[PDB]
Amino acid sequence: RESGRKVQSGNINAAKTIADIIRTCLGPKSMMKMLLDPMGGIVMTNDGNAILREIQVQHPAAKSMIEISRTQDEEVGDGTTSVIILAGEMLSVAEHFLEQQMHPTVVISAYRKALDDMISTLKKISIPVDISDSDMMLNIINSSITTKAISRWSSLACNIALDAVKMVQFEENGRKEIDIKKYARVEKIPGGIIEDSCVLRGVMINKDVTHPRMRRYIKNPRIVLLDSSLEYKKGESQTDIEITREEDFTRILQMEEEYIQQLCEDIIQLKPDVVITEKGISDLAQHYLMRANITAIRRVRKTDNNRIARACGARIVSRPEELREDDVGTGAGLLEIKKIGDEYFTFITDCKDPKACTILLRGASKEILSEVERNLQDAMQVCRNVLLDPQLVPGGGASEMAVAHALTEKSKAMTGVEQWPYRAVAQALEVIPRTLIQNCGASTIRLLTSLRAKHTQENCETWGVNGETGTLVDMKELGIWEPLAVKLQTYKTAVETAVLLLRIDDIVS
Amino acid sequence: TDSSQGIPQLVSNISACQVIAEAVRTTLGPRGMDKLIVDGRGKATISNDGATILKLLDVVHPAAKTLVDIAKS
């Protein structure tokens, strides 16, 4: 058990110890964390999710740090390093001084006012990006990839991502919000030429849909969605009687061939030749579709079936009865089998249900495959954020300084006792500028001073400090950009983390 | 595996001998000074010549063992 003053100081330390090295990793300039094992081995990492999971944290407040980076990772996957830095520095600067007077809830109210202050500044600072022009979105992706530090396979990945995300964009919710990227997938193929990377329609499956018989080419026939119940019944549509006797066996079997026969008949009417069954498909049942002259694909997981349903873009049905061209298989499914290797790869193309695409990636090996696939993963996150909100924000610490003076101006104007927390959130922003100064190797005093001076003359529209040139620089000129939405969400999560942690004033087991 | 060497090592070996030479010191006639040597098997033992009992002793030096062996000879 901890109580009172122990807790406030604890929060700040736990945040802080995670932060020191992880802040440095942000930007093309990346410091590499050593983790030393008891076995005497080494794991070297730049990725925030990896550092956090590996280390042993004893303190419950530390665990809250870890879990908020899970929050971030789930929404984007970039800025994951960032959220704990930001969240830490709110607590350092505000907390201990204002506690002695005693007002916690005040610091919290101030955080969320300030947060709103920052969201509004962003719309002005940012200019629109065309969400159907490839060239303009491309430079943005180019900024994000080089954080990871791969810069060769990256070049391909960017472009393939652009078409993949765009084609899985079609989400309606009355306001036309896009978070859809769940129709998208990466099909991995060991082997072949290193440079054949393309996009093909629907959703393509291989994680358990590699089978020796699948009809080699389908260029017309449909897929028939089923969660049936294609398997026999020993009664009508449920089992009422058991086989344990010679007499029971004989009677029951007649019923079992009938049930199967009427199912296949409702499947064949809408003309398939490739038929998918999630489960409820037996050794006698599959033999019945062969005798129906229907190729059956069977015993393949529920996740694959969700995927194949999305690929034709047609709804599933568990309804065993009268499956129509109108209900299942709606539009055209198509099935291509290529042997890239001597292994069966299944493309399912064509989605009706406006569009859908997934990615072909061909390595020449497993290792070669992986490099592209991660960097493509960064890439389609950007593509998405640009689609979501159609403004692109200038990178680095330029955006941070704009907000830094808006809070100096707001906090003076209001002259509440919220004033001093505003001032602590203004300075919490400045860490990102300090990280970029450190990255070149110049003194913090000299470059921060100049940056502040640029606010006064030109308002830090794009004039920040960049860590790969160690000077004040127009970010637009360099081709340093990032999307608005990524900035907003990183900021968002950091205030939530700062607010929640500050509410813990006592920890009691 | 033990190894020991030296001029004090030589001195050791002789010192062990004295201890067995004392066991048998006098037994020429019937005077000297005995102590009944009773074993851990619960047997009481004396003999008429002191070399007998000496044969039974197991010496933890090899150098001292030579002097045991010539007794047997």
Next chain:
Amino acid sequence: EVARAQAALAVNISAARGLQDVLRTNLGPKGTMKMLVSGAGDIKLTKDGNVLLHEMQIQHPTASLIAKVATAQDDITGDGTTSNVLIIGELLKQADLYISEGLHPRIITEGFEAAKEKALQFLEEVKVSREMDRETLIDVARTSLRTKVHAELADVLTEAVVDSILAIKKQDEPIDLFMIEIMEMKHKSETDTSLIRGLVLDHGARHPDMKKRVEDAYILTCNVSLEYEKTEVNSGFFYKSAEEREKLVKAERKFIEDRVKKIIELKRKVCGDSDKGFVVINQKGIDPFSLDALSKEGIVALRRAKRRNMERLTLACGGVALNSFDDLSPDCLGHAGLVYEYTLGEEKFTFIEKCNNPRSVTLLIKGPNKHTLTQIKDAVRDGLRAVKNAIDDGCVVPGAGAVEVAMAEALIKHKPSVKGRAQLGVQAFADALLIIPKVLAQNSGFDLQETLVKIQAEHSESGQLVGVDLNTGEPMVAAEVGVWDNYCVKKQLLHSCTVIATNILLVDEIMRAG
């Protein structure tokens, strides 16, 4: 529980510093041989930098990191891994002095980047084209072996290594990945290494002198057993009744009989005369009975050969590996021009040499079966990887720290990128290199400053890569002597040193992990 900031950098530099000591007394021929009993208690004799890191017990994160990057270098060149550590250590030392006065790690790193580009372009300028003649291969071969063994035994291994590479041109590989079969012989001296063109076999016949010279050899490499004795088996285990096991014993023995018979029919069909021999190599036994019958027909039959012998035979000889015997044409069987049996030591080794269509040469190392015979094995190993590089590149420079002073001189004088940020790492980069030549002088007993001023001046006047004569530890022209280094050696110390440095330099926390 954390070492942060100054405390994190401190741990890496301290380790590099103790390590450096060890692997300078492995550097060049003037370095010293090392043994381990500290790895497991048993007696190993090894004189390679990568290898020595694996054999020991490494728990320190900085030592371990250097061992991992080492692994890549060791595969490609197998030389310069004695060097890897030395350049890393000094490279850190330089950095440390500036930091302690007051300098950021990141500016150090930038100037490393600038350093690396210039340094690599210097290799390209300074490289001297060589031929692909024997003479020129002798000199890559001799200096690399000289690293890993003595001067005396190394000169013997020089001959063996070079004829193999000439033969590999015939196959038209530009690489080596075959002709690396190292086979050991039982002897009372190690100052012989013999070259055997084809293959060598671990054991020969159990019956000596069947026909121990085969003029015309038709090699059937098989691996089904022609001996399985009188043991009572069923499916290879005991069964409940005696009789059921027995019934199988008859049919199994009968199967063997017919297969021995196929050797008798095969000799007429392929041979037809005893003016030609016939070779059998069975990786499994053959009855003593079966050898006498085969022997009079003028067949040498080998028993208890290995699976490694079999794969090698199939490549070199043009042979087959079959799970049957039967009656097969000579079109299928491989041919060797010569077979000779050479008995030496306590084990006699049947040689099957002058193979047609070879792709495997065997370098036959004689030795007493001590750790010394393992020492020439790992010397010979990396000497093959060395002369492989000479075939890879076109250009081989004179070494002995000749290359390294030349490259250091080029950096000190101008800024490679013209900025002060770069310049702080660049000094650091240049002095790190100087460790390799100066230290050959140190081992020998010749003061280190005196060779630096001389060696560097003579570069300036001439344009010669003047090097070190190892033994005096005084300078001399590395070209004439034969102390040479490949393009790949001087490339791979450069790449390994930069990458390894910048991840330890850029620590800011080391925190323990389960």
Next chain:
Amino acid sequence: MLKEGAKHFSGLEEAVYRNIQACKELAQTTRTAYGPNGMNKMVINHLEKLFVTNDAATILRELEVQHPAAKMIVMASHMQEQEVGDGTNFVLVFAGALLELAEELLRIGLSVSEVIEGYEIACRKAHEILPNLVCCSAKNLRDIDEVSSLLRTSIMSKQYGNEVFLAKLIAQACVSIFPDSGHFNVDNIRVCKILGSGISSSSVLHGMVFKKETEGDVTSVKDAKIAVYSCPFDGMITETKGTVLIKTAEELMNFSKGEENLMDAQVKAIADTGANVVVTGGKVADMALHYANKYNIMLVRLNSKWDLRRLCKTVGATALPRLTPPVLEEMGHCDSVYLSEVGDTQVVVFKHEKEDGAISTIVLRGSTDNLMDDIERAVDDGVNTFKVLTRDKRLVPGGGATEIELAKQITSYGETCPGLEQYAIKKFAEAFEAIPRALAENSGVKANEVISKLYAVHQEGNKNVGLDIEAEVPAVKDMLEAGILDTYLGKYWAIKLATNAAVTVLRVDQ
């Protein structure tokens, strides 16, 4: 360390100092050894006996060291043990002496690597002047005095009381069956201890000697091929026991009837196959004995492990467990099998007459088996010095009389060459001086006196010293003309291996 990795127990201070001091302790057991001595070293090991040796091979293997520097030389000594006999001690003292001298060099400011270089040079010059120190050689190997002079040096190294009798004995009993010119066998000569009688009562017997008593009739046929079985009898049927005596009375009748009829068949199979001498390491029952009297087979009651071992090497035999009838496959090269009592104990005598693969036995008679273990060292080294594989063995002065000669030449030669090498060359001279020091220590006087007075007489090639009173004060004895000679080959491998061993161990630092 500074590292929690990179394990070493040697290096820095510990390579330079600790390794050398350890070599020095091993080689203390050979600064009481080699030539004239009265030293005895007792070593136990729970062998149910006392083991007395003045041979390096048995001392070394017993003694374990945890450092690679000291452990490595033991292997070099074994190598010289295979190729040659006595001088094993000389290999270890040399390497160990040179290493003490080396450390002093390191101290001054000289580097390791030149010192390493200068030994290879000194070793090459010493071998080159070595066949020019031949002063005497054999020409006939069937002549007992020319062989015995050679033998004598091996024996001497053990005790200085058993030189005369033994040196004659081995040559008398033959190790000259082989030509010794391409081929020699040393597992077809053993040293066979017969307990009982004095050690001047040690005798000549030709071919395989086994102690175990003979039972039954004895053969003298030439159809007698050896069959060896570890256990061919144990009772052909084993009992179980249900009344805790027998299982039971009617069954005991059958167990005995089946043993006697199975043993009849087994022993008749041996009789028929041409095996007319069977070696039993099992137990001779009455039933088994009764059969072998009828077939006419010499029967050897018992054997121990040691006796079985010599049959498998010499014969080309195998020792099979049996209770089901076998046949010949052990075979044998022995025609004749005779019976003769050595030690007043019935001994089995094997013989055949040939050059190659021919057998001999230096057989000993002794009060205890301990006294016979030391004598054995003298004798087995005397067989291993015979091996040179020539009939002109190019004998050089034994007993350490060469040593001072080598030292004088080497020190002068050192002066001529320049650089740092030379100091190692000089040290290389003073390592040979180790041998004259150890002979001085047992003799009872200091080192200064012997080395100076050998040097004083200049080039001689005879001078060495004994345990005597002649060995002390004028410190001059003739060991060319006392018939103390050793072979050129024995001194060659001793010096060669020792220089190689000293260089590899001086290199270590891991």
